[PDB]
Design a binder for this molecule. Sequence first.
Ligand SMILES: [Ca+2]
Length: 1006
Amino acid sequence: QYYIDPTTGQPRKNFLLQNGNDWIYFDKDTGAGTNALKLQFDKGTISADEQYRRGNEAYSYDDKSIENVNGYLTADTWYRPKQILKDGTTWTDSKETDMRPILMVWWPNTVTQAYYLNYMKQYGNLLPASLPSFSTDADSAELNHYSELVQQNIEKRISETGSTDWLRTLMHEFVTKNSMWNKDSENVDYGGLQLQGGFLKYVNSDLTKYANSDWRLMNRTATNIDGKNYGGAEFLLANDIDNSNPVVQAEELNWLYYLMNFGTITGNNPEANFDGIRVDAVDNVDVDLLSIARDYFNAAYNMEQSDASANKHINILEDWGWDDPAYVNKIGNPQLTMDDRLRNAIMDTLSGAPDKNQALNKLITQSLVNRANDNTENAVIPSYNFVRAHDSNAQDQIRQAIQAATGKPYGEFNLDDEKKGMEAYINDQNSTNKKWNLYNMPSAYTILLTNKDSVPRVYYGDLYQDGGQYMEHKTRYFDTITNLLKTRVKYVAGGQTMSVDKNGILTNVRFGKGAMNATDTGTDETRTEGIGVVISNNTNLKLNDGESVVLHMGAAHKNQKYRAVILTTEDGVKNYTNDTDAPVAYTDANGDLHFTNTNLDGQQYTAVRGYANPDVTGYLAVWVPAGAADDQDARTAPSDEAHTTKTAYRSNAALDSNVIYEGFSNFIYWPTTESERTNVRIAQNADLFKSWGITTFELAPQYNSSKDGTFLDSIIDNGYAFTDRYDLGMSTPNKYGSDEDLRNALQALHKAGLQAIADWVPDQIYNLPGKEAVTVTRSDDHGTTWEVSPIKNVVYITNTIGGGEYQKKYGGEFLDTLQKEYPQLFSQVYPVTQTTIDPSVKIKEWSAKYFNGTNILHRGAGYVLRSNDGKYYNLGTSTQQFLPSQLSVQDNEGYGFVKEGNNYHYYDENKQMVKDAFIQDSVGNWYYLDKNGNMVANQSPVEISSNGASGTYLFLNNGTSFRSGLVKTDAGTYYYDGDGRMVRNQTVSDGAMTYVLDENGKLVSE
Ligand SMILES: [Ca+2]
């Protein structure tokens, strides 16, 4: 049973003993003896190589086991191996927290494997710094050695750090350096409205069925209702809402109702609702939305009944396309079109530099209205107009100034950078030669605010400096533009004429309330109303001797004293806010005012000539009748008379009596004190706005910013880039204040008699935190397939699930009230979808099925893992269960140690019989397959070369190579060393033992 040395009580372990014809083997652990001849190979034995491959297979197909999205794997997937290469040395059952990167054991091809090896060496220090780079010509047996070496090194570092945080960072840095896993494979392109460098459209697939849609009707704008034309671009920014899906349409109506009742709903406060909407991004959404909004306002407010009804809810469109006005008029002018022809006329003739401005005649004709002799009402398409807006000649130039002032890439800035750029911007604004600011602002606003048949919109950043706390600092134009605004209320009314003379000088007249043509004699109030404007854009203007400029003030204004409102001087302008001290001019018997190159009655600045200063490049003079009462008001109230046409607004004296104020800039700073909050300040200044004749205050969009930095909107947090549509400063303040500050602002505007506009932004939503696998195609801004992209019908990981708590709370929640109060809204058929909205499903959380697509996300065409034949790996959730072979169980039949006849063989990974080779099992035993592939197991010394000269080996009957032990035979005792080779002619130590072996290997002593 045990073999002890009676002179040392020491047991011999791992000892092979001949006793007559019997052989006894005394084992390694306790020296317990067994019949050596009956030792048997363990049928369940597996090789060290096999152990290695099995250790690395996935522990299971559990969602917990393998990081996935809708069952799909990504380059960033980590998983739970069956075993973990403990400290790079000991295979040990994984724990559920033992997540390992799939890229530690799998690569899409040998080049990426080579690149991984190079990267882990160079940036990971997971291989010797002095190892040569691996080239695409790297041998696989070679790649695989170093790959295992790297895994051994990852596991040693985890043993040392107790962590994989570092390995997450490192592996993702590697991932993002592979084109197939970054923007390089996404065909980045900024053409058209690819503002963020490209789009991916969502398409139906059996692979991502939960993201399918029956809708996604794209580009169905005013010019493309039937989808047979091109339309406006469906795709603009972020996650594009599918506004063609009738369920989404019902949700847009729900949201609209929320905005229009915001004060009642969120504060039980009937003075804190919005009164109108701005429809943002009109030409990037299904034009059904304009009809849905109209229909709601008709049901709730009876817009089409009369001007008095419609004008209580002034709505506007952000509709850039020049074919849109005709369509807006045809559907009943439910929201006012802009007049982009007219704004461009101003841009082309006043706002450019002296060497750019064109002939002023364009102001007369390039518009929805021809203003040569505008002597009628209710006869043109009603519209609003503006010189600037938060994103029209503001945000681009302000970024140009920031870039120039700081040197940073366009569009990249911190707040310090913003302030520096603003300083440069305002300095430029105050210069005669402007790089980033429009020219002739006084003349431009004079045109804006004296035109007939227009609702003018004043821009915050022309009154106050664009960047700064709200209303922190005035522009150089504040006095000028507010003078114009107050003068508009007091004097501007009646018919208009515009003409440009032989000298290129524009004469613009309004006759005053009660007079439509120059020949009208007017009513009682006409005499001291009206206005006359002289504008040139010619900085070198010089009238010859005897030449003149004549304003035809008209038959109501014969032999009348006029006084100046604005005159141009060498260095700027002079404003006169009333009659006191204002230079005077008299009309003749015909109502004509005459000006020349000579001053009137010794009054400086009453001659006409060209100037060039920070205000005026050309000439500006504006004149009104002297002797108006201080309270004169030339506006017209809207009539209650029933409309005889299907329209909300009508272009007439009452509509013209309105002025919109776009009361924000993108570059308002976040407040440092509660008192700096925009909406607190708006509440404090309602009477001021009223004094300028503002009748509706356009607030910024109030949605809390997503703050994700993916577009200017979510860099300066203006409210156009948001995750939660219903969160208006509610979860936390927006840039303008809390929801209570917003409601107090609405209540204050109302107290002063002003309306308030909600910016309705149905086009998109940003920064949804939940990942979703979706089949997509790289496309342009119209959803047209990007022909050279390999991303066609490819599963891609999108960020499409979420929408915030207020979307959850309020989503679809007003649909019941709507159907009860206004059932007509639910039977209306819309022209694009050709069906009704669908309130049967409430949207409380967004997902891909409700989106047309997304901007490209820079994850790479190949981010979602697929085999070489194009089959997607999957846990089985969304498609066939399928994993990389490195992660799968294999059929071991005919592989590894296989008995055949009276012999054992070993078949390698190619199912090829191994010959003349040593193989180690998973528990450290060594076996030798002979030159015929037969395992040696005959317990007889045998000569084998493993590399050089032959060594003498001995294999027990179970096939194991006998090593580090004695063999005692009747003819002598021999010692086999740790390599399994007989030792001859030397003295050796084996732990506590020292053995002396003679030249035949016989033990001489121990
Ligand atoms: Ca869209």
